[PDB]
């Protein structure tokens, strides 16, 4: 109700990690991914990392992984749900060729009013078609206007995660046969592996719920092929079929 | 040549996993791996699973991310090093288009043969060239053979971990501009996060040195972009610039 509102640190879960130590995840970072990190998204990450969601802000290894799938797979066109304030975006939009194209849905655009200054300063703001809206009645919209000639090569979901189900019934008519799809957070801290786990955050709770559900549809769905990957916080790949 | 044993046994990092939870690792098999492999790649993992060496079979998790690759990038040409039962050539294989060529180089045919019939009753067989030689000395003449028209589009390297700086300088000539070079095992168990690490064989602790070595070479390479991934035991992506 009125009051102060949501607070991370209402949160079980902000301080777990997937991976064994937090110097193992350290030396990844410092070996391998500050050195090769843009100087814009150095500074997207910095400010963001003093956001009152910080938690939300994709990993870095992750984002440097998502970069070298979208150059491998040549993408050109592609879709992202849940901005924030644009790291994965403009991870993506440095990754893509000069006339590459973005569209980017978020439902506050002031988290994005926070990167766009990093993005304009990369000089990529002009791949960005950026969507303040609820996903869902967008990726509708898309579904009676859209042309075979215009679906996307890649989507990136790391929206409202209980939604996530919802999400893939839309793209897996708006990535192209071939395209990728990949659902950010699908490990959930590691609570997904059990099937009760203590004390979570109502909405952390959820999430868990959904991304078991998840999980197992996207493991029996036979329009795509998967594969899930223990990065970051979790994410799942999939390719269309047909 | 004389020394003390270096049977798998004689290791000490054999159980240890870079994932902070078994529960968790195993769901990721039970979930998203098992109901997606391949029955020929479940039977040639069983068989690995009891061999001698069974610590070198790259897990399955990683197996499903490696096709993901491949099919992505629409692949046709690839390299192996180091093949042992077979797993991630099998792997390979599957994912290829049924005209795609693999070169496949393992010191020990024998290992190799145990995996055969696996890959023999999956129908790829015919996609294998399988060279029995160290890896090195094939490199060589395949830079002195090798026109520009028939670069690989994509390279694993999974065999004698020291050697993996050597196989580097080939390989970024040996695959195409925009392919990859997969380097398998490049956390070294999270050994690679600490200066010291006791109570390791002599092998093992070479081998932690020469990743932390490997992995801040490829960080500083301006030949390739990379993306070091913390699925299996870690992996780090090379996608050759130029
Ligand atoms: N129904 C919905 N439709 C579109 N965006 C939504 C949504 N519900 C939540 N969101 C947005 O989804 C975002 C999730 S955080 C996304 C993180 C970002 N991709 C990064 O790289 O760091 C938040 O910005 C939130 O505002
Ligand atoms: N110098 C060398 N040249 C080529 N292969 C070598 C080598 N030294 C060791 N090897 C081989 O490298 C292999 C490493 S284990 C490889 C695992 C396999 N790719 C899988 O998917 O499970 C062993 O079979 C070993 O025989
Ligand atoms: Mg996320
Ligand atoms: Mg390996």
């Known amino acids: 109700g009125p009051g102060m509102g949501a607070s991370q640190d209402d949160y079980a879960l902000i301080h ?12 990844i970072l410092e070996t391998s991914v500050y050195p ?14 003093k956001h009152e969601w910080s938690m939300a802000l994709v990993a870095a290894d ?18 992202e749900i849940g901005v924030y304030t644009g790291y994965s975006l403009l991870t993506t939009a440095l990754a893509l060729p000069e006339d590459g194209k973005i569209t ?15 993005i304009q300063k990369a000089g990529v703001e002009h791949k960005i078609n950026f969507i303040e809206s609820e996903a869902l009645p967008v990726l509708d ?42 659902y950010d957070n699908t490990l959930w801290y590691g609570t997904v592996a059990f099937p009760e786990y203590p004390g979570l955050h109502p909405e952390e709770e959820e999430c868990r719920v959904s991304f078991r559900n998840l999980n197992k ?8 092929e998967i594969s899930q990957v223990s990065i970051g916080d979790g994410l799942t790949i999939c390719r269309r079929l047909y």
Chains 1, 2 share one sequence.
């Open 16 to 27: 777990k990690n997937i991976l064994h130590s937090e110097d193992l995840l350290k030396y």
């Open 36 to 49: 090769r990190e843009h100087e814009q998204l150095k500074g997207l990450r910095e400010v963001t990392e």
């Open 62 to 79: 992750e984002g440097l992984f998502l970069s070298m799938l979208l150059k491998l797979m040549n993408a050109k066109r592609t879709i």
């Open 104 to 118: 980017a849905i978020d439902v506050n655009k002031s988290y994005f009013e926070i990167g766009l200054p990093f």
């Open 141 to 182: 919209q898309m579904l009676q206007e859209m042309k075979e000639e215009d679906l996307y090569d890649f989507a990136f979901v790391d929206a409202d995660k209980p939604n996530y189900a919802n999400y893939h019934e839309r793209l897996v008519k708006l990535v192209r046969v071939g395209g990728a799809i990949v």
């Open 217 to 224: 549809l996207l493991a029996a769905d036979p329009r795509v």
